[model samples]
Target: MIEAILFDVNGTLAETEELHRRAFNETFAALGVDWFWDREEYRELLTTTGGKERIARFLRHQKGDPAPLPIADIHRAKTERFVALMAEGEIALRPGIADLIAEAKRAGIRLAVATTTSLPNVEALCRACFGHPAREIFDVIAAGDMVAEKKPSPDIYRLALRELDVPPERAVALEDSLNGLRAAKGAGLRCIVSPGFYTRHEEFAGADRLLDSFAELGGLAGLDL
Candidate 1:
């Protein structure tokens, strides 16, 4: 029986990368850079993890004569802008997300969030999703700021498992991208994928299952716990 369920935020809980893309675009402009990550470029950039890390990589690639402010500052501004956009009704939970979570809570199955997104981003999104008591909605939250290494490295998942106190086999992780799936599997958890438009074209060879929507899985009953 699965003891807990670990979820990724950005793409798993909601299709949020586009909003992130918009935020990054505005941040670059704010920094006096001509950088603009179009859909194609943003999709490719999604291969990397963490907002600051992505910005650093982009700057390195640019190798331009004049550099902007420090990466951390730009990322901080980007996060603020992203949160503002999120509050403007820019995102919503994926189909069946709330239903599944509600059922899991009713059954007393544990729930946790393990993702490469920062704590502020995680908290902001959860607030928009779960309201004032949002932080109480999950048992553990191991976000980007808490880990030195991001997904595809298993660090976040490992931290989550320790916090949840569930053996790898007892917890299933829900992911929407190849990096997240790799992270889950690397930490010895069974992973399910519900790919988003940005990640659909990437390979998903090791996911226990893939779906267009988790609602099709019919909530907690489908987990066989």
Candidate 2:
């Protein structure tokens, strides 16, 4: 039986993958870099973990050179621009997020977030979804900056489990991208995948379950162990 549920933020809880892609494209364009991330290309890029790492890989693949600038500097600039664009209210939580949270809370199941997104991104979603009570809903939030490695490394999920003091076998993870799936699996947790705009075509071979969206999963009470 599952005692806890850990959620991935970007594509799993929020419908913002396309918005992220658009932000990257627009930022690169403004810099006269001409970098384009079409949906198909982004599917391939999802193989890599983390937004900054993805941008670095894209730069390397597109220009055949990766060290022109500091990775952190470029990543910071990109994230700043992306957050500004997100302030325009272009993204929202995926279907059933609020509903599942409610059900989980009522059922006395622990809720946490294990995501490779920045703290600011997590805060923004919380504010948008539940105003002041968002922090109370999730027992723990293991964000990208909290770990040295990103998804597919098991670092973030492991951190979340440790913080929550829950055994991996008693927890289930919800993910969207292949990288997130790998990370959850590596941490010895069952994974349910709900693909997003940029990850629909990626392989989900190791997922414990797969769905088109959280809408199809009903709610937290419907999550199978």
Candidate 3:
């Protein structure tokens, strides 16, 4: 009786975490933090879960902190870079994503976004790949900034559940990170993992299912809506 699908952005919906990595690196460079998050570093940092939160956390790692880098401004700049990268060219949507979404919509199943990313960031990537009319698909978009707490805290996903008017049991979450799983599960929803890109080797504890992609679950017939 799953009536809806709640998706986590970043490494889940698409392989855009790399683009996010680039944004953070550029902001770090501008701040003279000399901080660079090579894949491994970024992988560990991803656990923190939100742009501003991530930036603020990274700052502490720098023993001799730079005079000041406004967490808000740097995150904003990072988002600007992210949107530019998303708009610059198309990036492949992970397998099963497009198909599942299309099938789910056709089936009249509800949709929502529960992510640790901002609204503009979500919409920018959505438009870059799905075009202008795409934003209308999701019934609700509970973004990082929209909620006081991000993933791993569960407030964001909890908000989505309330806004979508769907009980936790009526929805299943699609995510690629442990934090996303924790958040969704904390909100009482089942979650499926589709690890890739920056999260390929990360932990996904408490996930109800795991797959290479949504395609593996089959089409409309396979998922049973």
Candidate 4:
């Protein structure tokens, strides 16, 4: 039986990746850099987890080996921008997200967040969408900075599983990216993929199940969970 549900934040909980992109761009502008990540470039960057890590990688790819930007400072500013965007009520929970969470709660299933994003981002998302702190919605929150390795490494998911004290086999994960799926499966959990705006093109070959939208799941009533 599935005793817990682990959620991936960026694309799974909501389509906030666009907001993330905008935040990065805005932060770059405020920091006096001409760098801007259009949707396509941002899509590729999503392969790398963690905001600062992503910025570091992007810096490495810059032509002429430009002087390295202050990655940590830039990421912190981007996070603040993202949170401010959230406070502006610009994001919404993806279809069926709230319903399934409600179903899980009513069914006595545990909840956790296994995300490649930071704790501040998670807290901001929860407050913006549910009017509560993240802890009120999740039993555990394993954020990117908490573990040395991010998604596709299983570290974050493993952290959540450990905190929930549930075996990986007894937990189900909901993801929207191939990396998230790989991470969950790597940790021995069954993962369902619901492609988001930015991840729709991913093959997601190893996903236990795939959906165009969470609405198709109908609150997880008939899933393996």
Name model 3 segments beyond 4 Å from true: 31-33, 64-67, 220-225
**Lowest-scoring 10 consecutive residues by lDDT in candidate 3?**
216-225
Error of 3 at 178 (Å): 0.7
Any residue pairs clashing in model 1, and if so which?
A: none
Better of 1 and 3 by TM-score: 1
Measured on C-alpha atoms, candidate 1 has an lDDT of 0.86
Q: Over 4 Å off in model 4, which ranges?
A: 64-69
Cα deviation in Å at residue 182, candidate 2? Answer: 1.5
Best of the candidates, lDDT: 4
lDDT of each: 0.86, 0.81, 0.80, 0.88
Q: Which digits, one per residue and each the tens of the lDDT, describe model 2 over residues 151-208?
A: 8899999999999899999899999988899999999999999997778878999888
| Collision count for each candidate, in order | 0, 0, 0, 0
Cα lDDT over the full model 4: 0.88
Give me the overall lDDT of model 2: 0.81
Q: Estimate each model's TM-score.
A: 0.95, 0.88, 0.92, 0.96
Lowest summed-lDDT stretch of 10 residues in model 1?
Answer: 59-68
Instruction: Write one digit per residue (lDDT tens) for candidate 3, span 1-225.
Output: 578888888877788887888888887788787678898878888888887888778787666556375689878888888888888766767788888888888889888989988788888878876775335868888887787778788899888899989888878888888888888889998888888876667777777778887778666554333
Greater lDDT among 1 and 3 belongs to 1
What does the lDDT read for residue 211 in candidate 4? 88
Clashes of 2: 0
Arrange candidates by TM-score, descending.
4, 1, 3, 2
C-alpha positional error of residue 92 in candidate 4 after TM-score superposition, expressed in Å: 0.7
